[PDB]
Amino acid sequence: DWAAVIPPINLPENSRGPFPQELVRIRSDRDKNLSLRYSVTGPGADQPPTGIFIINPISGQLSVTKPLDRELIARFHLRAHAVDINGNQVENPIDIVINVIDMNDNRPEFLHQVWNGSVPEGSKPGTYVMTVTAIDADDPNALNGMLRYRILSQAPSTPSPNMFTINNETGDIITVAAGLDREKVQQYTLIIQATDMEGNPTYGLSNTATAVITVTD
Amino acid sequence: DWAAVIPPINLPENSRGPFPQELVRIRSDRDKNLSLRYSVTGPGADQPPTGIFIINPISGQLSVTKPLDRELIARFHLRAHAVDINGNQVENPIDIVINVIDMNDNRPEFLHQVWNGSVPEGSKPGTYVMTVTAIDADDPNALNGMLRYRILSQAPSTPSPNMFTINNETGDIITVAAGLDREKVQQYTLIIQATDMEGNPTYGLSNTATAVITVTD
Ligand SMILES: [Ca+2]
Ligand SMILES: [Ca+2]
Ligand SMILES: [Ca+2]
Ligand SMILES: [Ca+2]
Ligand SMILES: [Ca+2]
Ligand SMILES: [Ca+2]
């Protein structure tokens, strides 16, 4: 006989259900000669938040009761129990782990709308200027939460239309052209764009912020 | 002992892994007195597409080896096998279903960039004119593939800047104002927008097309 294994139960967040929705049905094969009742415990069940996951005490059917939000809780570790009439467990508790599958339901947001940095005159190419980054509430290990950066605009456009670059993963802005001269421009304004889905422009979500770089003496 | 039918296993499309990624560990309880080898069969394993799901022949650990795409294959039906070293079946094959969970990785697309329709002069409010629609490659039963429409603009702006409306669920363009007069204007140009996630404005994906409506005599 194959040995009972519960797989990870992966549920997408923001389910429309309808609810309750069946997940797994467990039972003890000791029920052939003993009378059992089943229960679930843990955060999601009997610990806060309570009642997201419930089990039918007679059938051992496990269910979800409402939509989930990975951004509140991404993982539930439940334990299911089989007990006799004395109230004693007749099986080792079984682990039921629930992973909430991430949806891309969060746009990138910048901590500040305006970021200030400076860079000295005559700085050589590759000179570090500043870091601007955004945050995406989605899962950083999924595409939904993986951010890429770029410069959409630089003003003014002299002596070179691309005085800077930004590291697409880290948000480090470094100079790439020479000719930084306070007598000619004292402040460059860059528009920074963050977009998720690893910067995919066609199905990624994006946002923008601005970086003001002062050229110092 | 616990007893439980393995439920369908849900995996998100476009997983970043890393790979290989463990899904379940299956085993026969006959391995306590026999030395067993495990295997998987079905499209996704040993049939095309090949090598997506693999099992360790000694441990019975099942794994994914690469990202999935709901838009290519949405479901895998696998069978897992237990044999002794003589090559003899020691268990009935077990069915393993894998559901590929839909991500919003597809932008709405209109069938045409330009849609042509007409409406007669002096048509009363509520006159159906035409239907313009888009398609979304994602699951039409999830938010990712559920579309809403709206009118972004109307040109020219007379006699009213809103001569029409569009059914948000359906793409049906209907007149809502009177004063349709070919002598004064023969054509209105509308920009129509489709956006998914049921038209969610902060994280829904959008696209546009134009409707040219001719006023007939
Ligand atoms: Ca969420
Ligand atoms: Ca999310
Ligand atoms: Ca996101
Ligand atoms: Ca896809
Ligand atoms: Ca999809
Ligand atoms: Ca979509």
* Protein residues placing their CB within 5 Å of the ion ligand 2: A 70, 102-103, 105, 138
Question: Do A203 and B105 make contact, defined as CB atoms within 8 angstroms?
Answer: yes
At residue B196, the 3 state secondary structure works out as: helix
Q: How was this structure determined?
A: X-ray
- CATH assignment at residue A140: 2.60.40.60
**How many C-beta neighbours within 10 Å does residue B88 have?**
9
B59 touches chain A (CB under 8 A): no
Q: Are residues B204 and B126 in the same domain?
A: yes
Domain range for residue A191? Answer: 104-217
DSSP state of A43: B
Q: Is A197 on the interface with B (CB under 8 A)?
A: yes
Residue B19 sits in the same domain as residue B121: no
A27 closest CA partner among B7, B6, B2, B26:
B2
Same domain, yes or no: B34 and B62: yes
Closest residue by Cα to residue B118 from B187, B167, B208? B187
Contact A27 B10 (CB under 8 A): no
Q: Can you tell me which residue has the tokens 């559901």?
A: B99
CA–CA distance, A50 with A47 (Å, rounded to integer): 5
Same domain, A10 and A49: yes
Cα A43 to Cα A11, A17, A65, B8, B172, distances in angstroms: 16, 21, 14, 24, 47
In this complex, which of A4, A10, A24 lies closest to B11 when CB atoms are compared? A10
CB B137 within 8 A of CB B145: yes
| Amino acid letter, residue B68 | L
Q: Closest residue of A to B197, CA-based? A: A105
Domain stop point among A54, A88, A103: A103
CB B186 within 8 A of CB B147: no
**Residues B138, B208 within the same domain:** yes
Cα angle value A92/A96/A97 (rounded, 5°): 140
Nearest CA to B205 among A141, A105, A69, A148?
Answer: A105
Q: Look-up: residue for tokens 């963050």?
A: A194
Tokens of A72: 């509140």
Rounded to a whole number, what is the distance in angstroms from the first to the last CA of chain A?
79
If one counts the domains in chain B, the total is 2
Beta-carbon separation of A27 and B4 below 8 A: yes
Closest by Cα among A81, A48, A79, A45 to A63:
A45
d(CA B92, CA B77): 16
Taking an 8 Å cut-off on Cβ atoms, the answer to whether A142 and B91 are in contact is: no
What are the CA-CA distances from residue B5 to residues A25, A33, A95 (Å)? 7, 21, 15
Strands of chain B, DSSP E:
2-3, 9-12, 21-25, 36-41, 53-55, 61-64, 75-84, 94-101, 109-110, 114-120, 128-131, 134-135, 148-155, 164-166, 172-175, 187-195, 206-216
Same domain, A124 and A40: no
Considering only CA atoms, which of A190, A162, A94, A6 is closest in space to residue B5?
Answer: A6
Rg of the Cα trace of chain B?
Answer: 28
Say if CB B54 and CB B45 are below 8 A apart: yes
Question: How many C-beta atoms lie closer than 10 Å to residue A24's C-beta?
Answer: 19
As a whole number of angstroms, the distance between CA B4 and CA A27 comes to 7
B111 in the same domain as B217: yes
Rounded-to-integer distance, Cα B91 and Cα B159, Å:
78
Are A93 and A160 contained in the same domain?
A: no
Query: d(Cα B10, Cα A68) in Å, to the nearest integer?
Result: 15
Which tokens in the block code for residue A119?
Answer: 């860079």
What's the CA gap between A15 and B41, in Å, rounded? 31
Task: Mark which of A103, A130, A159 sits at the end of a domain.
Answer: A103
End of a domain among B103, B131, B159? B103
Q: Which residues in B lie closer than 8 A to residue A146 (C-beta atoms)?
A: 16
Phi and psi at residue B199, to the nearest 5°: 75, 15
The Cα–Cα gap between A11 and A21 comes to 11
Q: How far is CA A88 from CA A7, A36, A59, A207, B28, in A?
A: 26, 10, 18, 56, 28
Taking the C-alpha atoms of residue B7 and residue B96, their distance in angstroms, rounded to an integer, is 8
| Domain identity same for B81 and B116 | no
Cβ separation of A103 and B103 shorter than 8 Å? yes
Nearest-CA neighbor of B101 among A139, A103, A41?
A103
Distance CA A2, CA B28 (A): 4
Picking from B185, B193, B163, the residue whose alpha carbon sits closest to that of residue B175 is: B163
Tell me, what amino acid is at B12? P
Angle at B64 between CA B63 and CA B67, to 5 degrees: 165
The rounded Cα B216 to chain-centroid distance in angstroms is 39
* CB contact B19 to A (< 8 Å): no
By residue count, chain B amounts to 217
Which helix (H) or strand (E) is A64 found in, with range?
A: strand A61-64
Nearest CA in chain A to B14: A143
Q: Angle at Cα A126 formed by Cα A123 and Cα A130, nearest 5°? A: 85
**B169 and B199 fall within a common domain:** yes
Task: State the Cα–Cα distance between residues A78 and B148, nearest whole angstrom.
Answer: 39
Pair (B63, B45) in one structural domain: yes
Q: Where are the alpha helices (DSSP H) in A50-179?
A: none
Q: Are strands B187-195 and B9-12 parallel, antiparallel or unpaired?
A: unpaired
Nearest to B134 by CA among B187, B73, B75, B204: B204
Residue A109's DSSP bridge partners are A135
Q: What is the CA radius of gyration of chain A?
A: 27
Same domain, B26 and B108: no
Using the Cβ of B107 and the Cβ atoms of chain A, whether some distance falls under 8 Å is answered with: yes
B139 by DSSP, 3-state: which? Answer: coil
Yes or no, beta carbons of A143 and B94 under 8 Å apart: no
Euclidean distance between the first and the last CA atom of chain B, given in angstroms as a whole number: 81
Interface of A with B in 136-165 (CB under 8 A): 141-144, 146
Q: Is A22 exposed, middle or buried (0-12, 13-18, 19+ CB in 10 A)?
A: exposed
